[PDB]
């Protein structure tokens, strides 16, 4: 059996780490698993028949310090409405905006949302939009283990209620949210440590009913290939 | 500045 196939078994739940930044400062972090995915809200609640586990972005303090930009943050949060939904279906992650804040996204590095090429897209309203495909990710991960390419990116960054900060410091944006499917973070780290020699290393997939896997480098690379053979490509 | 935030803001109306 291929333990990595658990990633795509129908009804499996991934863990998503949500980290929010107000003007470049981390203000919130929560890890969420839910069959419905997650939904970023300002808890100006709200509709309980909306889909997705509600993830409430914190109201900034009423402080005199930073009152200007924080009042703008509060305004953005107050206009989130139904919010920003993110969920998985098969090998794809999907997003939809359910309120009035135009939201732009990119798949980027963990520590930098805007590497210079602009957003990958705008999150649609009234229909779903694909924001991540596991297929190319695993292909690129295999290439990475073979010393033939960069580590594949998996951090979804959302710029909420403003234009994407192309050629502008991202820390000036009012509300930036990073979502990391922690299985993908784990898969990349497993590739990094495995290239170091070739004994056994442990990978934790951080998905429902998962158990930490102790694998050799050859075992790991073999499972990635078998996984990719059963996935969909254009 | 407030002018820059106002310019970059993208929130549609009800």
């Amino acid at each position: 059996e291929n333990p990595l196939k658990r990633l795509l078994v129908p009804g499996e739940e991934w863990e998503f780490e949500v980290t929010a930044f107000y003007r470049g400062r981390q203000v919130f972090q929560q890890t969420i698993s839910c069959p419905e995915g997650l939904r970023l809200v300002g808890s100006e609640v709200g509709d309980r028949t909306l889909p997705g586990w509600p993830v409430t972005l914190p109201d900034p303090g009423m402080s005199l310090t930073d009152r200007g930009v924080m009042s703008y943050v509060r305004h953005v949060l107050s206009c989130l409405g139904g919010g920003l939904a993110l969920w998985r279906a098969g090998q794809w992650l999907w997003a939809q905006r359910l309120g009035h804040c135009h939201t732009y996204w990119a798949v980027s590095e963990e520590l930098l949302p805007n590497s210079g090429h602009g957003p990958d897209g705008e999150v649609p309203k009234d229909k779903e939009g694909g924001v991540f495909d596991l297929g190319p990710f695993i292909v690129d991960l295999i290439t990475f283990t073979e010393g033939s390419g960069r580590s594949p990116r998996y951090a979804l960054w959302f710029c909420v209620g403003e234009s994407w900060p192309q050629d502008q410091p991202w820390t000036k944006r009012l509300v930036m949210v990073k979502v990391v499917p922690t299985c993908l973070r784990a898969l990349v780290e497993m590739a990094r440590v495995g290239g170091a020699s070739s004994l056994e290393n442990t990978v934790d997939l951080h998905i429902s009913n998962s158990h930490p896997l102790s694998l050799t480098s050859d075992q790991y690379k073999a499972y990635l290939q078998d996984l990719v053979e059963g996935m969909d490509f254009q | 500045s407030p002018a820059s935030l106002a310019s970059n803001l993208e929130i549609s109306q009800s």
Side-chain angles (χ1 to χ4, degrees):
Chain A
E1 200 182 53
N2 186 347
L4 302 190
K5 286 191 182 301
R6 188 183 299 273
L7 287 162
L8 291 180
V9 298
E12 184 73 13
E13 300 179 40
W14 291 9
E15 296 186 33
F16 296 98
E17 178 197 88
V18 175
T19 310
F21 307 83
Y22 298 163
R23 287 284 283 202
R25 176 172 56 93
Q26 184 173 318
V27 295
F28 175 89
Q29 188 173 74
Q30 183 181 8
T31 299
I32 307 289
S33 296
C34 180
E36 312 194 10
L38 60 93
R39 185 170 56 89
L40 305 175
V41 298
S43 273
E44 208 161 84
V45 246
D47 200 325
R48 271 183 280 191
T49 60
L50 288 181
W53 189 269
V55 177
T56 300
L57 301 177
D59 196 321
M62 218 48 155
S63 167
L64 179 61
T65 68
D66 251 352
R67 69 160 183 86
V69 296
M70 288 301 102
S71 68
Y72 258 104
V73 171
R74 191 172 297 106
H75 183 249
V76 170
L77 296 178
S78 82
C79 292
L80 263 179
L84 183 63
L86 179 68
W87 71 97
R88 185 174 67 86
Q91 71 189 57
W92 276 88
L93 302 181
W94 302 92
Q96 187 177 351
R97 76 149 156 113
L98 306 172
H100 290 300
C101 292
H102 288 240
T103 298
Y104 297 88
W105 65 276
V107 177
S108 305
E109 292 197 5
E110 291 258 20
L111 302 186
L112 179 61
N114 56 334
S115 51
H117 299 302
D120 289 334
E122 180 176 0
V123 182
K125 164 198 185 186
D126 301 336
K127 65 189 172 61
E128 79 219 81
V131 299
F132 184 88
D133 186 352
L134 184 63
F137 174 87
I138 297 298
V139 172
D140 292 342
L141 180 62
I142 290 166
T143 295
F144 181 59
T145 68
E146 290 167 350
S148 298
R150 71 186 194 188
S151 64
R153 279 85 175 282
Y154 53 82
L156 284 165
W157 282 91
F158 299 89
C159 181
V160 180
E162 291 186 88
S163 63
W164 184 266
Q166 194 172 356
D167 303 321
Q168 303 160 261
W170 70 266
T171 56
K172 287 202 177 177
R173 289 301 187 262
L174 294 165
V175 177
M176 297 288 298
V177 181
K178 176 170 71 169
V179 185
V180 166
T182 54
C183 53
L184 305 186
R185 175 187 286 156
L187 290 172
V188 172
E189 180 56 25
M190 180 58 171
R192 289 193 190 99
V193 298
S197 297
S198 57
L199 63 161
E200 282 196 9
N201 291 278
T202 300
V203 59
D204 185 354
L205 295 178
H206 303 287
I207 61 182
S208 58
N209 293 309
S210 75
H211 42 90
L213 311 165
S214 181
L215 303 170
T216 77
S217 199
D218 294 345
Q219 285 171 11
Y220 184 57
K221 291 171 78 183
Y223 285 145
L224 288 175
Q225 181 54 39
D226 178 73
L227 176 68
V228 103
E229 290 173 7
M231 304 183 56
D232 300 334
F233 292 92
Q234 235 55 39
Chain B
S1 68
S4 295
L5 290 176
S7 169
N8 283 316
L9 208 67
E10 292 193 22
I11 302 177
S12 62
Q13 243 62 23
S14 167

